[PDB]
Amino acid sequence: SALDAVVSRWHAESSWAARVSLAHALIGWTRGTNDAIVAAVEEA
Amino acid sequence: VLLWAVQRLIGGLSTIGAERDIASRLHVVLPGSDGAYGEAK
Known part of the structure; x- marks a missing residue:
């Protein structure tokens, strides 16, 4: 949903096309910010 | 005015009944x- 705003603004405005390189990565899970969660998802 | 207003409207209108x-x-x-x-x- 947060994507759908900024990327939609990118597709809308033609000024951001030559000024910003919008990029994004769908981050997964991190083991820091516990061990039980990591064990459960590694079993998954 | 859309999201928060109607969400608190639903909360209030559902609280009474x-x-x-x-x-x-x-x-x-x-x-x-x-x-x-x-x-x-």
């Missing part, structure tokens, strides 16, 4: 209008 009559289930319609459809989604 909570303890007075059980299984009185409130109903809401949502106005959803491609990019406009994306914002609606």
Whole structure:
């Protein structure tokens, strides 16, 4: 949903096309910010 | 005015008929209008 705003603004405005390189990565899970969660998802 | 206003409107309008009559289930319609459809989604 947060994507759908900024990327939609990118597709809308033609000024951001030559000024910003919008990029994004769908981050997964991190083991820091516990061990039980990591064990459960590694079993998954 | 859309999201927070109607969400607190649902909360308030559903609070009143909570303890007075059980299984009185409130109903809401949502106005959803491609990019406009994306914002609606």
